[PDB]
Symmetry: C3
Subunit: 215 residues, 3 copies
C-alpha cells in the first residue's frame, strides 16, 4: 500500500523541516543564514507535496514532479554557494535542472514509448550535465576553500551524484519502462530517494562548519 | 453584484499603477528606481488579474490566487530592501510566502472541511512566520537606518501585518468556513484588502523619502 | 504542412544550442560565462518547446507561449548585463515582459474579438514599454562602455526592436485577427521570428568581444 509510504515521507519531511528550523533559530552569521534558509525550504516544500499525495487518496502524480521541480534548484544553490560558484554557472545549473524536470514530466505524460524515450534521453542528458559540473567544476572551485568546506562539499557531492542518478533508474524499472516494480514499491523507492536527497543532504550540510563564513 | 466590486478593483489598481508610473518617470537615484519598479509592478499585475475576473463573467477564482501568488513576494521585497535585509532571510520570506499562497489554493480547492482545515493551518502558520519576521527582525534591522527610513518602515509594517491578517479571517467567514458572508460581499472585502495592501502600501512608500539612498 | 516548419525549428534551435555549447566550452572569463550561459539556455529551451510541438501531432498552442514566456526574460537579461543596467530597471523589464506574454496568451484564449482586443492592447503597450527602454535608456547606458560593447549592443538593439515588433503583426494577420494567413504559414513566420530572435541574436552576441569584461 502506497499510503504508508506516502505517510512516512510526509512525516520525515515534516520532522526534518522542524528540526532544521530549531537548529537555525539562533543563527547570526549571514553565511549560515542563507544555508539554513535554503536548506530548510527544500524539505519544507516536499513536506506540503507529500501531504497532498497522502490526502490525494479518496498512475501519474503531478505533486511528485512539482516537488522535484521546486526543490532541485535550491539543492544546487546550496552546493553553488558552498563553493562560491559563478553566477553564470549557477544560472546554467538551474536552467539545465528546470529542463531536466520539465522534460521528464512530458515523458511521463507520454504514451508512445518511443516518444517517451526521447524525452527521457534529453532529461538524462540534462542531469549528466549538472552532475558533470558538480563533480568536476565545483570540486576544483572547492579546492580554493579551507579544508572544512572542501571536505563537506565532497560528501554532499558524492551523495548528490549517487542519489540523483538513481532516479531515472527507478523510473526505468517502474511503469514507464521495464514494468518490473509495482506502484507501491516505486512510490517507496522514490520516497527513500527524496528523504535522503533532502533531509539527508540537509543534515550533512547543517551539521558541518562549512556553512560559516571564512575570512 | 460582484461585477461592480470587480469593476472598481480593476479601476483602482489601474489608476494606482498609472499614478505610480507618472511619479517615477523622472527618477535617477537607483535606490528609488528599484522601489518604484518593484512597487509599480505589484499593482500592475493585480490590474490584469482583476480585469480577467471582470471579463470573466459571460465559486473558486484562480485569478484571485495567482494575483496574490505573484504580488505578495514583491511586497515583501519592498520591505526587505527598505531595511537592507539579508539574502537568506529574503529567500526565506519568499519561500514561506509561496507556501502560504499555494497551500491556501489547495485548501480552497478541497471539499472535505477537515482537509481544508489542515491546508488552512499550514498557510496561516506560514503567514505568521512572515509577519513574525516583519514585525521583529525587520524592525531591529530598521533601527540601524536614518529616522526617515525607520519611521516609514514602521508604518508599512503596521499596515502590512494588519491587512495581511485580515485575509484568512475574511476567508473564514466566506464559503469555505462560516458561510456568513455571501459571495458579492466576500469579493468586495478582498477587493478592499487588495487595493489597500497594494496601492495604499505603494502611496505610503513612494511618497516618503525612505526610497532614497542614504550615505 | 506545419510539421516541416516545426521540424526545421526544432532542428535550428537544437543546432544553435549545440553550437553555442561548443563555442563556450573553453571560457574562463566570468563575464563571458554569464553571457554564454544565458544565451545558450534561451535556444536550449525553445528546442524542447518546438520538439513538443513537432511530436504534438498524432488552433492554440501552449508550447508556443511557454517558449516565449521562459525565453524572453533571458533575452532581456543579456541586453541588461551587456549595458550594466540597474537592478530596478532589470526587474521592471522582466515584469513588463511577463505581463506581455501572459496577457497575450489570455487574448489568444479569448473568443470575443472585443475582449481579445483589450488583451492585445495591454500586451502591445507592455512590449512598447520594453522596447522604449531598450532603444533609449540602454543606448545611453551603452554609451559609457568601450566602443566594442557599444556597437554590439546597437546591433542587438536594432535586431531585437525590429524582430519583436513583428510578432503582434504576425499575430494580427493570423486567425486571431485579419484571417489572411493560414495556419501553416503562421507557424512558419513565427518559426523564422523565433530562430532569428534567439539563434540570430546569440550568434551576434557570442561572436563579438563585447561579452568579455573590460577594466
Ligand atoms: C506539520 C509540521 C510537521 C510541518 C511544518 C509546517 C510548516 C510547513 C509551516 C511553517 C512555514 C514554513 C513554510 C516556514 C519556512 C521557514 C524557513 C524558510 C526558515 C529558514 O530560516 C531563515 C531565518 C532567517 O533569519 P533572520 O534574518 O535573522 O531573521 O529565519 C528566522 C529565524 C527566527 C529568528 C526564528 C524563527 C522561529 C520560528 C518563528 C519558529
Ligand atoms: C488601462 C490602464 C489603466 C492600465 C495600464 C496598462 C498597463 C498594464 C500596460 C503598461 C505595461 C506595464 C506592464 C509596465 C510596467 C512598468 C513598471 C514596472 C515600471 C517601473 O519603473 C521602472 C523604471 C526603470 O528606470 P530606468 O532604468 O532609468 O529606465 O522605468 C523607466 C522610466 C522611463 C524613463 C519613463 C517611462 C515612461 C513610460 C514609457 C510611459
Ligand atoms: C538533440 C540536440 C540537438 C539538443 C541538445 C539536447 C539538450 C537539450 C540536452 C543538454 C542539456 C542542456 C539543458 C544544457 C544547457 C547547458 C547550458 C546552459 C550551458 C551554458 O554554459 C555555462 C558553463 C558554465 O561554466 P563553468 O562555471 O566554468 O563550469 O557550462 C560548463 C562548461 C564546461 C566546462 C564544458 C561542458 C561541456 C558539456 C558537458 C558538453
Ligand atoms: C508542464 C506541464 O506538462 C503538461 C503537458 C500536457 O501534455 O503540456 C505543457 C508542456 C510543456 C510546455 C513542455 C515543455 C517543457 C520544457 C522542458 C520546460 C523548461 C522549463 C524551465 C522551467 C525553464 C526556466 C525559465 C526561467 C528563465 C524563468
Ligand atoms: C497549484 C494548482 O492547484 C491545483 C491542484 C488541483 O487539485 O493540483 C496541483 C497541487 C500542488 C502540486 C499542491 C502543493 C503546493 C505547495 C504549497 C507549493 C509551494 C510553492 C512555492 C511556489 C515554491 C517556491 C519554488 C522556487 C524555488 C522556484
Ligand atoms: C496562464 C494560463 O492561461 C489560461 C486561462 C484560461 O482561460 O486561466 C488563467 C489566467 C491568468 C491568471 C490571467 C492573468 C495573467 C497576467 C498578465 C500574468 C502576469 C505574469 C508575470 C509572470 C508575473 C511575474 C511574477 C514574479 C514576481 C514571480
Ligand atoms: C528532492 C528531489 C530530487 C533530488 C530529485 C531528483 C530527480 C532527478 C535527478 C530526476 C531525473 C529523471 C530523469 C533523468 C529521466 C526520467 C524521469 C526523471 C524525472 C525521474
Ligand atoms: C495583494 C494581496 C495580498 C497582500 C494578499 C495577502 C494574502 C494572505 C495573507 C492570504 C492568506 C490565506 C491564509 C493564511 C489561509 C486561508 C487562505 C488565504 C490564501 C486567504
Ligand atoms: C523567442 C521569442 C520571442 C523573442 C518572442 C517575442 C514575442 C513578442 C514580442 C510577442 C508579442 C505579442 C503581442 C504584443 C500582442 C499579441 C500577442 C503576442 C503574444 C504575439
Amino acid at each position: 500500500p502506497e499510503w504508508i509510504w506516502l505517510a512516512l515521507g510526509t512525516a520525515l519531511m515534516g520532522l526534518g523541516t522542524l528540526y532544521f528550523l530549531v537548529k537555525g533559530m539562533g543563527v547570526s552569521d549571514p553565511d549560515a543564514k542563507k544555508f539554513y534558509a535554503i536548506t530548510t525550504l527544500v524539505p519544507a516544500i516536499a513536506f506540503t507535496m507529500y501531504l497532498s499525495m497522502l490526502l490525494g487518496y479518496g498512475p501519474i502524480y503531478w505533486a511528485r514532479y512539482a516537488d522535484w521541480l521546486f526543490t532541485t534548484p535550491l539543492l544546487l544553490l546550496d552546493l553553488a554557494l558552498l563553493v562560491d560558484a559563478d553566477q553564470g554557472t549557477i544560472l546554467a545549473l538551474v536552467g539545465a535542472d528546470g529542463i531536466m524536470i520539465g522534460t521528464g514530466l512530458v515523458g511521463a505524460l507520454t504514451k508512445v514509448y518511443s516518444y517517451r524515450f526521447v524525452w527521457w534521453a534529453i532529461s538524462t542528458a540534462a542531469m549528466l550535465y549538472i552532475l558533470y559540473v558538480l563533480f568536476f567544476g565545483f570540486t576544483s572551485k572547492a579546492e580554493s576553500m579551507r579544508p572544512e568546506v572542501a571536505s563537506t562539499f565532497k560528501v554532499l557531492r558524492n551523495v548528490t551524484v549517487v542519489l540523483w542518478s538513481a532516479y531515472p533508474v527507478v523510473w526505468l524499472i517502474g511503469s514507464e519502462g521495464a514494468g518490473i516494480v509495482p506502484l507501491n514499491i516505486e512510490t517507496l523507492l522514490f520516497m527513500v530517494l527524496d528523504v535522503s536527497a533532502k533531509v539527508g543532504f540537509g543534515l550533512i550540510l547543517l551539521r558541518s562548519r562549512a556553512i560559516f563564513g571564512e575570512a
